[PDB]
Design a protein around this nucleic acid. Structure first.
Ligand SMILES: [Mg+2]
Ligand SMILES: [Mg+2]
Ligand SMILES: [Mg+2]
Length: 905
DNA sequence: CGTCTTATGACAGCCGCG
DNA sequence: GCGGCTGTCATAA
């Protein structure tokens, strides 16, 4: 019964809105919106509207939006503030939906599709639409159907109708392996000519017009192509038929490098899935092709085909259509796992914004704050212009590069939101300034107490303790959501370790997986049924537990990033509530908060162990402390632990029963010293790390800031079945490191931390012997391809040319003149290999598009001229020199006086 | 959407240094 | 050849 918007659009002096009504049906309005803006007035003008600072405001109701828009600019030319929401879409949604929006996703039409274009000329540039669209697959979320639009006749070949019978069959049988779940859901429709195809597609589009349009590179390729191909054949107005309100606009996106053109479809919220992935996955990938992401996410990968893609419709039109269908389903499987579309809806309806505006945290928070203020009858300050200006951030401790045997970590929960809430930081809560002492003076508690009446930050800023703060109040509503979804995440993880422990000694009875909610710890009853369960049904349970973890991971990470984005926006010049005094007040409090508790943890552990002046905190970054636990184990004497798990149990209790209350009273004292509104500095225990008992193995090491590795047994409550490596910053964790090298360097680390020096040297030798045998794609570096043109000097490398860019210019030379081989695209990623002296190619390296094999017309030469020695040293040895140097180990056995004896037994 | 932030690392080109 | 500086590309928060 409760209605909600789908899309909202401003065109001239009218608001074009698509919504779902009281009876759950999709309809369209054209409301001539009467917008309101505000202005300062004298105190003898008692009204109900006030600005955030308390100053009285008068309401200005306009006839049209153009009038309101042109009132603003002739209020600036006099120098008078023009308060209010100037984005009239946000104003409308706030007016039309003055309540908590609850929505039904089954009545929201989500569509994803993909185009096929045979192009011998090369890449079919979406701006020119030079070649016929020979295939479209369109999935509708309301119908649950894959609509295939196949072209049988082009100037590139006449082809037979595609068979759903053949598509269903196994590749071994001669079939295509289109998943069985989507076989009954395909609507096939063949077409004799391109015009007909395109014609019915539009009719289909009008009847089933997308609310959300998604897919892989839809904004970048699909939409612009179908728009321009229709435009060039039928005319502008027919191409306008892609928009419900018949309005399209070419948008120019220009970054620090070049510029690209996309097309707005007024009345459709386009969420290109690749863009959801880059924003919400929190994984930098070597490639962003759908095949690559699919294999990473789902462990499937696509079936192969003979020859280049431009010859595929010719030779095998059957597979040609099947692949286009699979590709569309891939995105749906990825979303079924990651849930990025659900996330974007939950966010956009909560913020009361255009769904696409989820990509903009600034737009998001400006609407959240406006809507929170509007409820109190308050008026938002005008967006001012500001010069970009630097300001300070977090503290990071300079660790001593060494091995560290027993380590335990602690970390502040929602640091910046918690700081905002503790200090009551907000644009309207500012109280004034106090004279500041050097940051060190506060850390040791030797500076004078800043205030008795106000809440302070060591940057000199003051805040009201009694008043409620707008930023603190709204961000609170977000923090509790994160704790909920993180709780589910950890529980699914804890449940996974129980299951993995049951996989060690499994039964073999023909049974089914237990139906349970993985978001919650298993009861004693369920535990026992698991201990007597089959591997088949255990593997399914595990897969489902990990799917819940990922769903929880994604949920809470987005809630984390959006929260910290509010802080970030405080340091952004375009944010309505930009204020460096606030942004700095947050970060300086963090610096003090860490170093403060470092001192406190150092004091407590000294007294407790019976020593004085010993540094226990070895490292910290922003809001963490890494505690050396060696003295805590040594005082007991590890000779009193029966197994590894025994000493893990000891440290966990020591943390929870002894260190945490000592930390809690530490922060409590700091909350007093600053005179804050409320104590919110809570530190969760994270890692318990160390070598397996009675083994060689260094447990962990640090090379420098942001670079360390630990052998974790327990992470934040989860007690693993087998120890897991925590590696931060090291090459194993960078998308630029070759796939095989990441794998090898990790094994080196695993041996260092779990097994010791002899084990490491053993593996170094064997890897060094087998290196030359590895897949060339597995041993290639990855890098982004920015500013190719800048360094392109007539085909050759220019001054200051980066290694990977040189690689591209070499590639471009070797593929030249040949009609089409895969070109390298600006701003995208490339594989890079070194080449030995005197090769048939120009320079010393070669690069080519990532996630793909190089053209067969240049491959053999590359493989033959690879510089394995250079590649091994640069990517493997040099990084391993770093880890072993820091850990005070040798990866290679050093000359000894023992070398003069004969050992053969 | 193209208008969240800073801190900090490795590596490569370049250029000097009898 | 190594070290200082700068540009570029990465990650940890
Ligand atoms: Mg495709
Ligand atoms: Mg934290
Ligand atoms: Mg942290």
């Amino acid at each position: 019964m409760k209605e909600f918007y789908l899309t909202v659009e401003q065109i001239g002096d009218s608001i074009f809105e698509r919504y779902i009504d009281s009876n759950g049906r999709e309809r369209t309005r054209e409301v001539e919106y009467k917008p309101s803006l505000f202005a300062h007035c004298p105190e003898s003008q008692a009204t109900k509207y006030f600005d955030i600072y308390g100053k009285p405001c008068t309401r200005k109701l306009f006839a049209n939006m153009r009038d309101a828009s042109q009132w603003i600019k002739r209020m600036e030319d006099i120098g008078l503030e023009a308060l209010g929401m100037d984005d009239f879409k946000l104003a409308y949604l706030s007016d039309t939906y003055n309540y908590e929006i609850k929505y039904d996703h089954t009545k929201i039409r989500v569509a994803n599709f993909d185009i096929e274009v045979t192009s011998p000329d090369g890449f079919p540039e979406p701006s020119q639409a030079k070649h016929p669209i020979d295939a479209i697959t369109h999935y509708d979320s309301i119908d649950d159907r894959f609509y295939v639009f196949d072209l049988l006749n082009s100037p590139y070949g006449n082809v037979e109708e595609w068979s759903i019978e053949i598509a269903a069959k196994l590749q071994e049988q001669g079939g295509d392996e289109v998943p069985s779940e989507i076989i009954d859901k395909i609507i096939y429709m063949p077409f004799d000519n391109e015009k007909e195809l395109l014609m019915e597609y539009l009719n289909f589009w009008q009847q089933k017009t997308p609310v959300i349009l998604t897919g892989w590179n839809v904004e970048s390729f699909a939409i612009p192509y179908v728009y321009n191909r229709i435009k060039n054949i039928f005319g502008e107005s027919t191409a306008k038929r892609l928009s419900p309100h018949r309005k399209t606009r070419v948008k120019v996106i220009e970054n620090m490098y070049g510029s690209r053109e996309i097309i707005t479809l007024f009345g459709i919220s386009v969420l290109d899935y690749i863009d959801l992935y880059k924003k919400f996955s929190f994984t930098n990938q070597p490639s962003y092709s759908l095949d690559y992401i699919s294999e990473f996410e789902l462990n499937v990968g696509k079936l192969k085909y003979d020859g280049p893609i431009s010859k595929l419709r010719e030779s095998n039109h059957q597979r040609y259509i099947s692949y286009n269908i699979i590709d569309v389903y891939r995105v749906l499987q990825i979303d079924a796992k990651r849930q990025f579309i659900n996330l974007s809806l939950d966010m956009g309806y909560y913020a009361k914004i255009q769904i696409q505006s989820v990509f903009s945290p600034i737009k998001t928070w400006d609407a959240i704050i406006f809507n929170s203020l509007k409820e109190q009858n308050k008026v938002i300050p005008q967006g001012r212009s500001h010069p970009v200006q630097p300001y300070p951030g977090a503290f990071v401790k300079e660790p001593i590069p060494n091995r560290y045997k027993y380590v335990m970590s602690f970390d502040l929960t929602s640091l910046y939101p918690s700081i905002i809430r503790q200090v009551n930081i907000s644009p309207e809560t500012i109280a004034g300034t106090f004279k500041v002492a050097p940051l060190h003076d506060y850390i040791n508690a030797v500076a004078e107490r800043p205030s008795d009446v106000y809440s302070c930050s060591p940057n000199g800023m003051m805040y009201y303790k009694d008043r409620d703060g707008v930023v603190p109040t709204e961000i609170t509503k977000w923090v509790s959501q994160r704790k909920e979804h993180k709780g589910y995440m950890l529980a699914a993880q804890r449940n996974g370790e129980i299951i993995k422990e049951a996989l060690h000694n499994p039964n073999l009875s023909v049974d089914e997986p237990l139906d349970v909610d993985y978001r919650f710890d298993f009861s004693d009853e369920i535990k026992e049924k698991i201990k007597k369960l089959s591997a088949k049904s255990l593997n399914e349970m595990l897969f489902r537990a990990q799917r819940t973890e990922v769903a929880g991971m994604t949920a809470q990470m987005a809630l984390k990033v959006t929260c910290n984005s509010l802080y970030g926006a405080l340091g952004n010049v375009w944010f309505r509530y930009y204020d460096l005094r606030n942004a700095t007040a947050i970060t300086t409090f963090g610096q003090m908060a860490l170093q403060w508790i470092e001192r406190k943890v150092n004091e407590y552990l000294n007294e407790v162990c019976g020593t004085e002046g010993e540094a226990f905190v070895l490292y910290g970054d922003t809001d963490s402390i890494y505690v050396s636990a060696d003295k805590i184990i040594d005082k007991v004497g590890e000779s009193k632990f029966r197994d590894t798990n025994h000493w893990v149990d000891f440290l966990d209790k020591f943390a929870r029963e002894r260190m945490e209350p000592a930390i809690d009273r530490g922060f409590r004292e700091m909350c007093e010293y600053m005179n804050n509104k409320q104590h919110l500095m809570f530190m969760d225990r994270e890692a318990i790390a160390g070598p397996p008992l009675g083994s060689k193995g260094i447990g962990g090491f640090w090379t420098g800031k942001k670079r360390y590795a630990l052998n974790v047994w327990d992470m934040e409550g989860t007690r693993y079945a087998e120890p897991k490596l925590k590696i931060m910053g090291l090459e194993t964790q960078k998308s630029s490191t070759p796939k095989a090298v990441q794998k090898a360097l990790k094994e080196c680390i695993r041996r260092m931390l779990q097994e010791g020096e002899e084990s490491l040297q053993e593996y170094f030798k064997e890897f060094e012997k087998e290196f030359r045998q590895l897949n060339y794609i597995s041993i290639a570096s990855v890098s982004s391809a920015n500013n190719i043109a800048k360094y392109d000097v007539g085909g050759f490398p220019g001054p200051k040319c980066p290694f990977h860019i040189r690689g591209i210019l070499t590639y471009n030379r070797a593929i030249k003149g040949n009609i089409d081989a895969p070109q390298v695209v600006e701003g995208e990623k490339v594989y890079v290999l070194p080449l030995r002296e005197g090769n048939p190619f120009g320079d010393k390296c070669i690069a080519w598009p990532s996630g793909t094999e190089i053209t067969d017309l240049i491959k053999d030469d590359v493989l033959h001229w690879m510089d394995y020695t250079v590649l091994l040293e640069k990517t493997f040895i040099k990084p391993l020199e770093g880890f072993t140097s820091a850990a005070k180990l040798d990866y290679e056995k050093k000359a000894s006086l023992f070398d003069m004896f004969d050992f053969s037994a």
